[PDB]
Amino acid sequence: ENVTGLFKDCSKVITGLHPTQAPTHLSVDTKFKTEGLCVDIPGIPKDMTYRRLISMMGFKMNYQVNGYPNMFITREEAIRHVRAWIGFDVEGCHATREAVGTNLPLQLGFSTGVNLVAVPTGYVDTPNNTDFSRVSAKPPPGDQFKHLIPLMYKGLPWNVVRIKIVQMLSDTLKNLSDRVVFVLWAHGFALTSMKYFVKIGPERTCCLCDRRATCFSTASDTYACWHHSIGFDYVYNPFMIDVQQWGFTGNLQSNHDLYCQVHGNAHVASCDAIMTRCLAVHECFVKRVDWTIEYPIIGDELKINAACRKVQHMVVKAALLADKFPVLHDIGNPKAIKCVPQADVEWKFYDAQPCSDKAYKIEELFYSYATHSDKFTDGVCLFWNCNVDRYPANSIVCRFDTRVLSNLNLPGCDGGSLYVNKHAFHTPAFDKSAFVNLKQLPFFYYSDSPCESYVPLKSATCITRCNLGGAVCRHHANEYRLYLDAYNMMISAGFSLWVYKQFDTYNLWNTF
Amino acid sequence: ENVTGLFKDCSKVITGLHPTQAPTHLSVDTKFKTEGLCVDIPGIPKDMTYRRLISMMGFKMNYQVNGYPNMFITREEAIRHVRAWIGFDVEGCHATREAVGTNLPLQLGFSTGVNLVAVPTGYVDTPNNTDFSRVSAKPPPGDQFKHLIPLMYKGLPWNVVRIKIVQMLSDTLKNLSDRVVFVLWAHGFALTSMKYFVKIGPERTCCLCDRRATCFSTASDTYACWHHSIGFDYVYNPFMIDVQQWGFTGNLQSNHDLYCQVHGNAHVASCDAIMTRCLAVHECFVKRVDWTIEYPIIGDELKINAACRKVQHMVVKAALLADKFPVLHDIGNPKAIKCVPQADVEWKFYDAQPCSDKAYKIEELFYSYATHSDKFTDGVCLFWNCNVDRYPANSIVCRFDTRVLSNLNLPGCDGGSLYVNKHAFHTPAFDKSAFVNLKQLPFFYYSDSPCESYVPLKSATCITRCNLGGAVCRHHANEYRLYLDAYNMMISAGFSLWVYKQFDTYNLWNTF
Amino acid sequence: LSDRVVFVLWAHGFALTSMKYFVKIGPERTCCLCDRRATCFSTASDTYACWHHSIGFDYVYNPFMIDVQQWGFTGNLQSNHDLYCQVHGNAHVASCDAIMTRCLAVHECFVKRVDWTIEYPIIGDELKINAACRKVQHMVVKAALLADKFPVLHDIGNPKAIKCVPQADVEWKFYD
Amino acid sequence: AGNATEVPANSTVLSFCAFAVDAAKAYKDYLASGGQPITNCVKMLCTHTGTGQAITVTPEANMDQESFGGASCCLYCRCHIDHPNPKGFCDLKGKYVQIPTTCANDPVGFTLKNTVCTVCGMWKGYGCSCD
Amino acid sequence: AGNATEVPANSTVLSFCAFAVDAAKAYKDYLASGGQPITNCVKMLCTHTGTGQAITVTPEANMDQESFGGASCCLYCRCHIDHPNPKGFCDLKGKYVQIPTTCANDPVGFTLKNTVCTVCGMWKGYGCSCD
RNA sequence: GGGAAUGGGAUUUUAAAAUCCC
RNA sequence: UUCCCC
RNA sequence: GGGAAUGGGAUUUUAAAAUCCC
RNA sequence: UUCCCC
Ligand SMILES: [Mg+2]
Ligand SMILES: [Mg+2]
Ligand SMILES: [Mg+2]
Ligand SMILES: [Zn+2]
Ligand SMILES: [Zn+2]
Ligand SMILES: [Zn+2]
Ligand SMILES: [Zn+2]
Ligand SMILES: [Zn+2]
Ligand SMILES: [Zn+2]
Ligand SMILES: [Zn+2]
Ligand SMILES: [Zn+2]
Ligand SMILES: [Zn+2]
Ligand SMILES: [Zn+2]
Ligand SMILES: [Zn+2]
Ligand SMILES: [Zn+2]
């Protein structure tokens, strides 16, 4: 049929509108139509006191305009901008008394964890202009929606609500991305609610810097980014993805529960937003690591990457001098390069599948503790950023703590986390039971290089042959501070270091 | 100009494509079409987020290329490769809510008994390429298809489905044939599903041996046979035949039930595949044995034939020497070849159906116990590989057990089996009610040859002159072992030996 | 953990209706292989056992229970649980509702304040952990005071004026 | 429930200009990129013997003009958004608007682009004789 | 339901090449055996005064060339199969491809057999002059 | 309260209907 | 007839 | 085409209704 | 509203 529910008249008046007042041809009264046109009848005066509610349901954002960005994006662009993902859900209420036939936004929830309750407000048609005003409404007729019953008396005016939305989005995303991606399940009512707080147009620039404009103010027609959006009320040019359009059957919870167990509490807007983002992250990221997609630097990724390599070199160089194992096993190394080339030890490499390394010396190993307990009975093992069920008693382990959230460590699926440094690594949930056979590694600095020279260093953790005397030179006094900062940065990023229980520093004091 | 349903655009978008993105002249929008050509309008942008599902229904495999074998073979050719026959049936689901107008494979079934469920996956034209991705789908409406509703929540990815298909085909067919012939009932959706796991090309050879290539691996661009197809993901150069093209009307179940009562349970893919292969076997082999068609010696056929010859010779010689029948009726043997020429007995020969020879050498005999019980009261009847409803009480019978399946014995129609030993013989279902007048033939050896000649034999079933002494001579001691091996091979192959109830070996012992 | 079971319920009607299927009652008994309280009953042998010896037993013998809704709550379980806790959810699944019920009971009984009047039995390794904590605290406070020589040490949160190192040259302040 | 008032062919542009900061610019950019104008306007039937003024209380079209209802030719009344008028009132609504016959394909765009003459009461450049 | 894309005269060659391991070799062998070229391409009406480059964003056909839509001159876009490029993307889709008017009867085969000179953007052996 | 969808093909008769197969 | 959203 | 069913309890008000819990 | 049978 040649009708749509967009801009539907929900008023209870049995008659239509006058030809000089009806917005469309389907809105004019039947008494005026004649042979497909409308004829002015002096006997029917136009109405000057009517109020007609207009439905904002049924938007179609499929415009193709030359200088305008498109709101809906492809899945590859969403994978690129995963740092900007904010789940979004809306729970609504039904217009009841003076108008029936539309739903109004009641509780808007985001994956950040907030719920904003708004006064039921609609767009009514008056003889002068469309008026944005409060309308009578009732909660949906269902038991599942009974928790929405109090919220009808707890809403805020939309002027407050949209300013709070802009504040929350800017405070969440200003150190992560230059845009917002809304992760939706069903976009119809989400778009109907976005009509209340989202405006679009050509791409712009912030009024105080060179960043992309993300917010618009109607008090003064100015555009700003996340950093300069204080007092701004509208979201300008957002992006969105609909997850249900990825071939899903059933509802949101039935699909989320197949892959995750730590989120629940359906029909709450924030909880469903978290569920939507979790399902999207699972569908786009928990398969394998993709090195064809690269992410921009937003912080201390370079320092973390350097500090990890520095610690990995120093710990292994100290361990191979402490007890002098004749052979070691390196497990989980993507490429066949030993951490310390100068070591006089037999390196044997094992991995499930290397990162396309030409050196095929790496043996196949799909490790499991109950299966490979007798594989590495002798010699020190290395597990650097390798995630297994349990480590043996003779290992040196670096493990990332998924419970440490930061700009690099986004929330993940089923208790895991999405670590985005240069690529996106999905890490399963941290378990301390995997470290029952090990102990936490202490901090220490070690070097054998010759040295030549504001308080001088006074610490028992500087294991150097220079420190055997009563003083230490300035070269090691600076390099120890550099390694201390590197170790602090590495442990603050979320990395935990574990060593075998027999490890101690005294043997290192015997290396001189 | 007429159009075809192949590669149909199933997407719900009302407009066409840009002239730079339309794959054909029918796909471009009516804005650009002009005078049978297209125009580049400067202002109109091209779409960059469309997802257009493409219909894979309507393939025509009637190509004629010199180096490329044809998939659809004739039934005269399929009869020669009956050992490669695998029935194949697919159930489907309908694309919905983002595209309407195509069907996707849901459950794949084979005559081997397996069922594989796949997630609904389609080919989607995108502005960069064609994406093979999961799409929205629903089960067909109708009561008969309601059992397909649970299958929407348990599908596997297609990359796993085709690995399992190749594994199952190689496990079934590596000891039967060097190819696969798919037995189909409607080849339309069968071809639409074969698009997902079948590749074609010129004839190749296995990478590790000189056998015909039946499988292809995309991960290594290599070809293999059934023996070497571990980890291969495509079926390379298969053959197929459509049984419904043989003149059938109605559905598959209607035509199958006319001849067979064993199989049923329609609309499950494996059951339909079993019914299709059963109907093909009935149409090709239940009529009569064709001696003109020979089959390759896959394994142990010559040994079983020699064992059968030796056992028949020994048992007929022993019976004729022990009981001294006046006449032996070699029922069912058109040839007058006496298995023991020197026996003091006359021979008569019959055929179940009239042969091409019009001479009076043999007499017609369509034996049934209700009509020919008293025609052979005297003497003995040699029912070697002749199937009757019931045998008389004076017979020596060898009967094949159709319940003993092997590489030489394939499942047949209505409980029978197709035994392929240099020829294809369809044998009716085995019933133990046909031997109520007989008894199982004991294993024994008899020697009438002169005894002129390493462990000494200590078995009392060796009816020979040297057994009446301290030890059996090493000639008979090894000939008895050879006959025991022949007997064990024959009765393991499925042959059952029966003799009249008054048979006893002691009458042989008085011969010496 | 214990020698009994206390079932934490929200509406004991259907809970009792279900307990009819797997609960037996009677006078107080003793385990068949030891001197512990009997918590399980076996119909196949007419014998009673504790938690340690209940292999193959099919009934729970003499359990205890408490109804939390009788403590003055109004509304449903999820409504009252969400007032204090944000970790648990997913109502109308039985295990999740049980977790919410026990969480609400724990909140109503223990989140207020620690009750020093109620003591609990030493199930295992409690005295060793207490002695270890005492020794570690003494060593680390002595080492810090000897190394850095602070003028004042603030023993925050300790109502008692018990000095872990009496001979340290430092003044002590105590708070609650 | 309710009465449907819009045709599907208007679903795109009306969804566009409703979200746009500047609906007048958005409509012109939509037209300039190959989009079709707004349909389903109310068209009046008359003897075409009127005065010819741009906006009138009664249909008063000339021989080369067609009268439309004023509410259907205002873009903001179609998109149900804020009028940029000084008090938010509408000048077309409650009146009948005269569209030239050659411009009758896009009556919304004609009212957006063109203006009226305050001392003669008809469209500038499209019939006003004072210039 | 749905809109048809192809004509019956392409049913064989598009079914063949969509099943082959090597679709370019399959199409060449199909043509060698007397098969007919893939028809129903998207040809442009242009002024034939362009620069004559092989692949452009606008129809730039020389007088000795004819301009086609790129997605209609790609076998892999025509058979809806994977592109043999390492990235899997198409160099022809979204562009205009100029085919010499002598080889304009089979543009799909021409785009398979030929290649583009990097320094001038012409088809090698067809309008290219760098040696 | 809001909204969407109801697959593919062949044949015959007078775009539609019927029949048949999947 | 069926599904999604509230 | 035929047929069946739509749980348990508490409280209040005037058998019924409403509210609340499961 | 849901299920069974034909
Ligand atoms: Mg929700
Ligand atoms: Mg079937
Ligand atoms: Mg419960
Ligand atoms: Zn800024
Ligand atoms: Zn989750
Ligand atoms: Zn030094
Ligand atoms: Zn091989
Ligand atoms: Zn059968
Ligand atoms: Zn002998
Ligand atoms: Zn006990
Ligand atoms: Zn809790
Ligand atoms: Zn207006
Ligand atoms: Zn004027
Ligand atoms: Zn291409
Ligand atoms: Zn060149």
Numbering used by the authors:
A (entry chain D), B (entry chain B): 2 to 454, 465 to 523
C (entry chain H): 177 to 352
D (entry chain C), E (entry chain A): 1 to 131
The authors write:
However, the efficacy of remdesivir is limited by the unique proofreading 3′-to-5′ exoribonuclease of coronaviruses, harbored in the nsp10-nsp14 complex (hereafter referred to as ExoN). pmcRemdesivir is a broad-spectrum nucleotide analog (NA)-based drug that has emerged as a frontline antiviral during the COVID-19 pandemic. Once metabolized into the active remdesivir 5′-triphosphate (RTP), it competes with the natural nucleotide adenosine 5′-triphosphate (ATP) for incorporation into viral RNA, causing delayed chain termination and halting RNA synthesis. We reveal that remdesivir incorporation destabilizes RdRp–RNA complex while enhancing RNA binding to the proofreading exoribonuclease (ExoN), facilitating remdesivir excision.
